[PDB]
RNA sequence: GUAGAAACUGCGAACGGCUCAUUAAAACAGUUAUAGUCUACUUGACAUUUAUAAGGAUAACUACGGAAAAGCUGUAGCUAAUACUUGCAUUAUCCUUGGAUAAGUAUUUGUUAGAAGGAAUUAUAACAAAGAAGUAACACGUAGUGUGUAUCAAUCGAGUUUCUGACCUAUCAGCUUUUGAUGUUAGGGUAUUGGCCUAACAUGGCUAUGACGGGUAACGGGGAAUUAGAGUUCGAUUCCGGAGAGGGAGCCUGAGAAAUAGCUACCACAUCUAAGGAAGGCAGCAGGCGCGUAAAUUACCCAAUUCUAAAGAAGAGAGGUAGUGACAAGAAAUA
C-alpha cells in the first residue's frame, strides 16, 4: 500500500532491446510488498501500456526488515522477451507452459542403440 | 547342406534343402570361383552349370577366397578386406575364417547360375526384374536413351507412383551435373576476380616503382 | 596423448583480466589469432565485463550472431576472438567507438574515441622481410604482412596505418626525443620521451625514459612503442595522461572529497 | 519450395578427471640457446612447366541365408557426393616498333656474386641438371559468404639445450673400458644436433671439494607448523611441472599418441557356453569385498564456469546443487 521504489544504476542496451537497472524497495513496518505491486507501480512510472514486458529477480529482505533489493528488466515487446529470454524465466512470467520431463533416462536409449545396427536402430 | 542360387541376369534366387552324401559329392574338394556341373542335385537340373561364390560352416563362420586349407584359420584383418569392418580408423582385429574348400562341414553354398539346360525349373529362369533405382548423373541418362546434345534431359526421368488426386504426378529424383545458368555465373566471377586481381598488382608495382625516387 | 591444451583454470588466468576468484573453476581461454595471450583479452570479456552489456556468456553470443561488432572493420563473431592493443572497435546498432589502452595500472581499457579518429590506427614493425623479386615486406605487433614498405622503415619504429584501405599514410622514426608508450613490467601506461639507448650487444638494450614530471624510468627496447614526434601524440589518451603518482600523493588526492 | 528414422562424408575423441608405484644431478626451480628443429584449428599477405562441364564403384535399400552365443556377418541386384579419380585456358620483363621467351612453389646436387645481425656457407641474384604439390568439373542468397588449396609470416604448443641449486650412510675407496667407456675421421638414421647407431683409429674419462655403491615408511616446487633473532620439522592432497592406467614389450590412424572406456602377443586373475567357440581391465562418478586405529549418496541438473561439433537451439558424473559429516574456523541462549 505505502512503499517507495528507488532504480539504481539505470542502463539503456541497444544490442540486446531492453534497459537495465537495480532495485530498492522501501516499506517501513511492513513485510515485502509482492511482485505485482512492484510490476504496476514501475508501469505506471514509465507509462508502459502494458505489463507483461517486465522481468523482476533477485530478490533479498536486508535483516531487520523494512526494505528489500533486486533486479529489473524492461523490454520493447514481448516478441523480444520471447526471443532472447532463457526458458525457466519465461515458464515463471506464464508466456509459454512446456513441462515435459523425458528425463536423464534417456542414457540408457543413447547406449542400447549403439549397439543395433543400420536397419533396426 | 542349404543352397542358395541366385540369377544374376534376372536378379531372382530360390533355395533348397539336400540332406544326401552322394547328391553332393561332385562338389566336394572344388575351391570357389570355379564351375561345376548341377546335374546330381536334381532331375530338373540337367544341363545347368552353377558356380561356386561362398558359403559358411557349422558354426557360422564365412568362407574367404586366400586361403587354401579346408578347415578354419585365423588371420588380422584390415580395412580392406571382406569378412571384417572397423570400429575406429586404422583398427586392426584378430578373427577365424573358414578356408576356401568345399568340405562335408559346410552348411551353406551361396553358388549362383552360369548355363540352362533343357527344362525351366520354375521361379528361377522364367522371370525377370527391373533395376529398382534410375541414374542421376546427367551423362548417364544421355547413355541410357541415346540422346544428343539437343535433348533436354529434365524430361527423361521417372518418378514412382503418387495417386493423390491425380492419377499420374511422377515426383522425381533431383539429377546431377546438370548445366544450370548458375554454374556460368561461376565462370564470369572467377574470371572477373583474376582480372581484378591482375590490375591491382600492376598499380601497386608501379607505385612501389615511382616510389623509390 | 599429451597433445595441446585446451582448457584454463580460473587462478592460472593474467591477472589485469580482474576475475572473481569465486564462481567458476574455468577462464574463457581466448582463440589464437593477432595477439599473444598474455597481451590482449577475449571479447567475452570486453563485451561483459568491462562494458556490462551481457550479463551471462550465452547473452555474449546471442551478441553477437546478429552481425553488429566490428574489430578493425571487420565483423567477427568469434567469442574468443583476441582483441589487442591498438584496435578500434565498432558497434553499428549504437553508433559508438572505442580504442583499448592500458591505463597507469596494468589493465586494458575502452578510451571511447570519436568517429573522425575511428579510420587509422598505429602498428609498430617487428621486422623487414626480402622475398622473391626483391620485394620488401613488414611485419607488425598486429601479426599483419605489409608489402612494397618504404626503403627509410626500420625495424623498431611505427607507421600510421589506414583501415578502409590496408596502405600506409606515413611513419615515425625511434630516436632520442621521440615520444612512447611502455608496455611491460613495472611500468605499464606511462607515458615519457626518450633519454638514451644504450646497445649491450650480446644481451639486452636499455633505454631510459623521462617523464613530464622530470621522474625517470627505465625497462627493456622490446616494450617500447613509439606514438609520436617529439612535440605531440598522434591519438588520444586517457585521462591521466600516462602520468603515474605515488602512493603518498595519490592517497591524498583521493581524499580531496 | 519446407521438414526429414537410416547411411556415406567431415571434425573432435592426444583436452578434461584420477593416483603418487617408480625416480637422489634423475625429475624440478631460477637463468639461457635453437645460426640444430616440427607445428592442425585461427589471423595477414597471395600462384608456376567435352568446357553450355569428363570417369567407374560403393553404402544405406530389396530378395535368398548361417551361427547356442558376440557392437559377427555371406551371396546376388541397383544408386549419390566437398568420398575416390581425370582434365580445358593467360600474362610479366630485353631494347611508339618486334622478336626473344619466364616456359617450375617447396626441395636436392655442382659453379659463383653478395637490406640485417655481436657473428653467415643470411635474405637475395645468376649459370647447368632433377623436381613433389598446387592455382575452384563445389554449396548458399546473401555488390556478399561457406568449403577446399602451394609458399611465407603471425598465434596456440612441443622436442632438445647452457649455468647454479638436494636427505642419511666410509662396518661402501677406487670406479668405467672384450659386449661404447672418453675422443678423431667417414657414413647411416631422425623433424633436426649428438656414440643415437655402424666401420677404422687413439687411450682416454670421474674421484677424500666423497666417485662407484647402500637406505628412504622420498614425486619436485609455489607453500605449512612453531618460533624475540638465529633455527628445527613437514609438503599423498585447490595451481605449475613429471610419471602411470594389473605387469612388460610391440604397433595402426592422425597435425599431435609408443594412447589403453585404440589394436596384437606373453605372465597373473577372472566371465558366458549347446564344449565347437566368444568376450575382459573403476589409481573417472556412485557402490561392494578385503585391509586395517583410520574415511560419505548405487541422489538432482546442465540454470552458472567452460569445452567439443555440420558452433544460439545438442552433449558433458568436467562442473554446479542438495544428502551424510563435534576434521578444522566465526558469531552466540540457558535470563
Ligand atoms: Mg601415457
Ligand atoms: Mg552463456
Ligand atoms: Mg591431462
Ligand atoms: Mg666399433
Ligand atoms: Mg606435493
Ligand atoms: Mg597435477
Ligand atoms: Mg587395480
Ligand atoms: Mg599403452
Ligand atoms: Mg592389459
Ligand atoms: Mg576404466
Ligand atoms: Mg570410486
Ligand atoms: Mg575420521
Ligand atoms: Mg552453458
Ligand atoms: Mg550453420
Given at each position: 500500500?505505502?512503499?517507495?521504489?528507488?532504480?539504481?544504476?539505470?542502463?539503456?542496451?541497444?544490442?540486446?532491446?531492453?534497459?537495465?537497472?537495480?532495485?530498492?524497495?522501501?516499506?517501513?513496518?511492513?513485510?515485502?510488498?509482492?511482485?505485482?505491486?512492484?510490476?504496476?507501480?514501475?508501469?505506471?512510472?514509465?507509462?508502459?501500456?502494458?505489463?507483461?514486458?517486465?522481468?523482476?529477480?533477485?530478490?533479498?529482505?536486508?535483516?531487520?526488515?523494512?526494505?528489500?533489493?533486486?533486479?529489473?528488466?524492461?523490454?520493447?515487446?514481448?516478441?523480444?522477451?520471447?526471443?532472447?529470454?532463457?526458458?525457466?524465466?519465461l515458464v515463471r512470467e506464464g508466456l509459454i507452459d512446456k513441462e515435459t520431463k523425458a528425463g536423464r533416462r534417456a542414457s540408457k536409449e543413447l547406449?542400447?542403440?549403439?549397439?543395433?545396427?543400420?536397419?533396426?536402430? | 547342406?542349404?543352397?542358395?542360387?541366385?540369377?544374376?541376369?534376372?536378379?531372382?534366387?530360390?533355395?533348397?534343402?539336400?540332406?544326401?552324401?552322394?547328391?553332393?559329392?561332385?562338389?566336394?574338394?572344388?575351391?570357389?570361383?570355379?564351375?561345376?556341373?548341377?546335374?546330381?542335385?536334381?532331375?530338373?537340373?540337367?544341363?545347368?552349370?552353377?558356380?561356386?561364390?561362398?558359403?559358411?560352416?557349422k558354426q557360422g563362420f564365412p568362407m574367404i577366397q586366400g586361403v587354401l586349407t579346408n578347415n578354419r584359420v585365423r588371420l588380422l584383418f584390415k580395412?580392406?578386406?571382406?569378412?571384417?569392418?572397423?570400429?575406429?580408423?586404422?583398427?586392426?582385429?584378430?578373427?577365424?575364417?573358414?578356408?576356401?574348400?568345399?568340405?562335408?562341414?559346410?552348411?551353406?553354398?551361396?553358388?549362383?547360375?552360369?548355363?540352362?539346360?533343357?527344362?525351366?525349373?520354375?521361379?528361377?529362369?522364367?522371370?525377370?526384374?527391373?533395376?529398382?533405382?534410375?541414374?542421376?548423373?546427367?551423362?548417364?541418362?544421355?547413355?541410357?536413351?541415346?540422346?544428343?546434345?539437343?535433348?533436354?534431359?529434365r524430361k527423361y526421368v521417372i518418378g514412382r507412383a503418387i495417386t493423390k488426386n491425380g492419377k499420374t504426378k511422377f515426383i522425381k529424383p533431383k539429377?546431377?551435373?546438370?548445366?544450370?545458368?548458375?554454374?556460368?555465373?561461376?565462370?564470369?566471377?572467377?574470371?572477373?576476380?583474376?582480372?581484378?586481381?591482375?590490375?591491382?598488382?600492376?598499380?601497386?608495382?608501379?607505385?612501389?616503382?615511382?616510389?623509390?625516387? | 596423448?599429451?597433445?595441446?591444451?585446451?582448457?584454463?583454470?580460473?587462478?592460472?588466468?593474467?591477472?589485469?583480466?580482474?576475475?572473481?576468484?569465486?564462481?567458476?573453476?574455468?577462464?574463457?581461454?581466448?582463440?589464437?589469432?593477432?595477439?599473444?595471450?598474455?597481451?590482449?583479452?577475449?571479447?567475452?570479456?570486453?563485451?561483459?565485463?568491462?562494458?556490462?552489456?551481457?550479463?551471462?556468456?550465452?547473452?555474449?553470443?546471442?551478441?553477437?550472431?546478429?552481425?553488429?561488432?566490428?574489430?578493425?572493420?571487420?565483423?567477427?563473431?568469434?567469442?574468443?576472438?583476441?582483441?589487442?592493443?591498438?584496435?578500434?572497435?565498432?558497434?553499428?546498432?549504437?553508433?559508438?567507438?572505442?580504442?583499448?589502452?592500458?591505463?597507469?595500472?596494468?589493465?586494458?581499457?575502452?578510451?571511447?574515441?570519436?568517429?573522425?579518429?575511428?579510420?587509422?590506427?598505429?602498428?609498430?614493425?617487428?621486422?623487414?622481410?626480402?622475398?622473391?623479386?626483391?620485394?620488401?615486406?613488414?611485419?607488425?605487433?598486429?601479426?599483419?604482412?605489409?608489402?612494397?614498405?618504404?626503403?627509410?622503415?626500420?625495424?623498431?619504429?611505427?607507421?600510421?596505418?589506414?583501415?578502409?584501405?590496408?596502405?600506409?599514410?606515413?611513419?615515425?622514426?625511434?630516436?632520442?626525443?621521440?615520444?612512447?608508450?611502455?608496455?611491460?613490467?613495472?611500468?605499464?601506461?606511462?607515458?615519457?620521451?626518450?633519454?638514451?639507448?644504450?646497445?649491450?650487444?650480446?644481451?639486452?638494450?636499455?633505454?631510459?625514459?623521462?617523464?613530464?614530471?622530470?621522474?625517470?624510468?627505465?625497462?627493456?627496447?622490446?616494450?617500447?612503442?613509439?606514438?609520436?614526434?617529439?612535440?605531440?601524440?598522434?591519438?588520444?589518451?586517457?585521462?591521466?595522461?600516462?602520468?603515474?603518482?605515488?602512493?603518498?600523493?595519490?592517497?591524498?588526492?583521493?581524499?580531496?572529497?
Amino acid at each position: 500500500d505505502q512503499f517507495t521504489i528507488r532504480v539504481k544504476k539505470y542502463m539503456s542496451n541497444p544490442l540486446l532491446r531492453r534497459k537495465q537497472f537495480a532495485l530498492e524497495i522501501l516499506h517501513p513496518n511492513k513485510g515485502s510488498v509482492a511482485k505485482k505491486e512492484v510490476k504496476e507501480r514501475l508501469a505506471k512510472m514509465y507509462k508502459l501500456n502494458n505489463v507483461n514486458t517486465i522481468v523482476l529477480f533477485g530478490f533479498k529482505t536486508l535483516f531487520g526488515g523494512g526494505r528489500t533489493k533486486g533486479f529489473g528488466l524492461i523490454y520493447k515487446n514481448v516478441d523480444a522477451v520471447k526471443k532472447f529470454e532463457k526458458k525457466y524465466r519465461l515458464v515463471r512470467e506464464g508466456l509459454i507452459d512446456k513441462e515435459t520431463k523425458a528425463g536423464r533416462r534417456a542414457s540408457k536409449e543413447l547406449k542400447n542403440r549403439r549397439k543395433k545396427v543400420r536397419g533396426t536402430e | 547342406m542349404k543352397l542358395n542360387i541366385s540369377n544374376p541376369l534376372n536378379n531372382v534366387q530360390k533355395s533348397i534343402e539336400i540332406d544326401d552324401e552322394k547328391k553332393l559329392l561332385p562338389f566336394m574338394e572344388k575351391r570357389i570361383g570355379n564351375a561345376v556341373p548341377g546335374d546330381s542335385i536334381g532331375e530338373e537340373f540337367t544341363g545347368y552349370v552353377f558356380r561356386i561364390t561362398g558359403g559358411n560352416d557349422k558354426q557360422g563362420f564365412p568362407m574367404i577366397q586366400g586361403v587354401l586349407t579346408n578347415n578354419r584359420v585365423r588371420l588380422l584383418f584390415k580395412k580392406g578386406m571382406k569378412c571384417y569392418r572397423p570400429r575406429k580408423k586404422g583398427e586392426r582385429k584378430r578373427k577365424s575364417v573358414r578356408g576356401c574348400i568345399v568340405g562335408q562341414d559346410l552348411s551353406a553354398l551361396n553358388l549362383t547360375l552360369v548355363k540352362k539346360g533343357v527344362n525351366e525349373i520354375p521361379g528361377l529362369t522364367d522371370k525377370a526384374v527391373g533395376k529398382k533405382l534410375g541414374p542421376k548423373r546427367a551423362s548417364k541418362i544421355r547413355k541410357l536413351f541415346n540422346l544428343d546434345k539437343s535433348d533436354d534431359v529434365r524430361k527423361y526421368v521417372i518418378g514412382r507412383a503418387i495417386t493423390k488426386n491425380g492419377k499420374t504426378k511422377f515426383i522425381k529424383p533431383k539429377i546431377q551435373r546438370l548445366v544450370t545458368e548458375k554454374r556460368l555465373l561461376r565462370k564470369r566471377n572467377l574470371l572477373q576476380a583474376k582480372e581484378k586481381r591482375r590490375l591491382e598488382k600492376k598499380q601497386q608495382l608501379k607505385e612501389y616503382k615511382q616510389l623509390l625516387n | 596423448g599429451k597433445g595441446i591444451k585446451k582448457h584454463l583454470k580460473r587462478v592460472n588466468a593474467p591477472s589485469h583480466w580482474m576475475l572473481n576468484k569465486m564462481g567458476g573453476q574455468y577462464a574463457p581461454k581466448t582463440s589464437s589469432g593477432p595477439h599473444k595471450l598474455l597481451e590482449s583479452i577475449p571479447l567475452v570479456i570486453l563485451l561483459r565485463n568491462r562494458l556490462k552489456y551481457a550479463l551471462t556468456f550465452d547473452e555474449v553470443k546471442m551478441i553477437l550472431i546478429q552481425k553488429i561488432v566490428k574489430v578493425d572493420n571487420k565483423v567477427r563473431t568469434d567469442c574468443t576472438f583476441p582483441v589487442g592493443l591498438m584496435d578500434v572497435i565498432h558497434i553499428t546498432k549504437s553508433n559508438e567507438y572505442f580504442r583499448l589502452l592500458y591505463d597507469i595500472k596494468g589493465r586494458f581499457v575502452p578510451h571511447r574515441i570519436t568517429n573522425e579518429e575511428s579510420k587509422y590506427k598505429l602498428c609498430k614493425v617487428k621486422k623487414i622481410l626480402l622475398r622473391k623479386g626483391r620485394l620488401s615486406i613488414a611485419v607488425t605487433h598486429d601479426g599483419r604482412s605489409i608489402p612494397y614498405i618504404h626503403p627509410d622503415v626500420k625495424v623498431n619504429d611505427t607507421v600510421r596505418l589506414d583501415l578502409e584501405t590496408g596502405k600506409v599514410l606515413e611513419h615515425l622514426k625511434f630516436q632520442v626525443g621521440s615520444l612512447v608508450m611502455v608496455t611491460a613490467g613495472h611500468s605499464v601506461g606511462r607515458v615519457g620521451v626518450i633519454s638514451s639507448i644504450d646497445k649491450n650487444m650480446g644481451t639486452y638494450d636499455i633505454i631510459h625514459v623521462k617523464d613530464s614530471r622530470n621522474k625517470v624510468f627505465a625497462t627493456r627496447l622490446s616494450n617500447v612503442f613509439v606514438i609520436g614526434d617529439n612535440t605531440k601524440p598522434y591519438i588520444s589518451l586517457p585521462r591521466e595522461k600516462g602520468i603515474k603518482l605515488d602512493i603518498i600523493e595519490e592517497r591524498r588526492n583521493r581524499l580531496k572529497a
